[PDB]
Every structure is written in structure tokens, then in C-alpha cells.
Amino acid sequence: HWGYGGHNGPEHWHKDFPIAKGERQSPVDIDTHTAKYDPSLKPLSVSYDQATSLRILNNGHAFNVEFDDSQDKAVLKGGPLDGTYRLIQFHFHWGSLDGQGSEHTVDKKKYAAELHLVHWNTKYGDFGKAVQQPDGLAVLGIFLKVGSAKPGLQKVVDVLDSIKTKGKSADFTNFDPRGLLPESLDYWTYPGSLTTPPLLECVTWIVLKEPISVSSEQVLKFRKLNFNGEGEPEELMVDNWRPAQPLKNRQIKASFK
Ligand SMILES: CCNC(=O)c1ccc(S(N)(=O)=O)cc1
């Protein structure tokens, strides 16, 4: 199976998922000196007031906080998007040490982690149909740096002990994802892909410029998770990030001057 180990990591994925070498793969490096301000981009509308989180799952590659997406509760609109995108899950990618972990980079800088809030375009009816479309998904990406603690992250880190290994889940209701956002919603955007197999080219990426700060203790708790299942040899869940892929024939646009 694919992973981020010594023998099944990102450089191997193309053998089962040839789109790994496609034309709109993610993540990418964001060159802040080449991305152009686009005055036609609108403010992002993040409407998370009615979000309903349900569960948190260790799926062997990350942990996903899952939401009820059976109605337009938590939605993303505006920005570069046409239409309404419903929040289905969020997860993170992170490193074995603070100097790596993000998927996107900014002028080659790697952040300690990156949060992905995954949304699907409701014009396609369900998530599985949305991932087959070039405008099916919108993923809001937020960098994490280590410094002050993020109060709104602590409920997530304190449940992690209960989902240490692959296939474990826990009830996770009433979690408010607004507590994971930075102050500013200035962003970069470009067309890309899922960053894990099947690597489908179905994503409008929206990457916030302002990182959130998390504490060393918070990220250390992500790094105590396991990729393996219960009872199997322990492999810490660290360095679950794909490195930057070729930009090819794409432009990265900035929402801000
Ligand atoms: C189809 C099963 N895979 C997913 O639904 C999926 C969602 C988001 C991302 S990411 N890392 O680009 O936000 C990758 C994969």
C-alpha cells in the first residue's frame, strides 16, 4: 500500500497512480514574487457557524475530523469559487521536526504542518462524484508554525491518544473549526490535485497567507500517532507530506496586494 515509509513514499506513487506525474499535481511551491495579485478575486466566504463535526478517524495516513455534509451547514464560497462547497473533513500533514511538515511551501519555506479543510461542490451531489470533476473540490490550506499554543486546536490534540493507531475512531462532536483559522483570509489560489492517492486533479486550492501558531507541545502530540494498526510494529505518524510538484502550465493568483 502507498504511504510515506522508506519503500512506499511519494516517489513510488506513480506506479499505481500514474496521474502522479500529471499536469496539475499538488502541492506546489508558492513563489511570492511570481504570484500576481488578481483584483477580480473576491473575499473568501467561510461560513462555519452551523458546522457539525461527528467523528475523528486515524486512517493510517493522517487523522480526519469528519463533518455532517448531508446539508449546507459549513460552506466555503466566494474567493475564486463559483457556487457552494460543503465541508466534509479536515486533516493535517506534519513533520518529524519543526522545520518540515507542510505540503505547500512559500518561497521554498516549509512550515511545521499544514491544515487542509476539504470541501466539495454541491452541484455534483456527493463527494465521490465531485472528485471526478476539475472543479469538484475546494481545499482551504493553512500553515502551522510553532510558537504560541492555538487554543482552538487543543480539543483535537487531547483526543489523539484515543485514536493512536490506524482504523481507530472516536466520537468528536461540537468541534468548531473557526478556532483553526488565522485573522486574515488573504490567500493564494491555483488549480491542482489531491495530495494523496488517488491524486485526482479535482481541486481548487486556496492557501491562506497567514499561518496559525501552535505550540511545540501540540505538534509533539501529532507526532505520537501511529501509521500502523494496533498490535503491529510501531511506526510513528510523522512526515506524512508530499513534497512540491512541478507547477507546469499554471498560475498562482494572490487575493491581496
Ligand atoms: C478519495 C480519498 N481521498 C480524499 O478524499 C482526499 C481528500 C483531500 C486530500 S488533500 N490532502 O489534497 O486535502 C487528499 C485526498
Ligand SMILES: [Zn+2]
Ligand atoms: Zn491534505
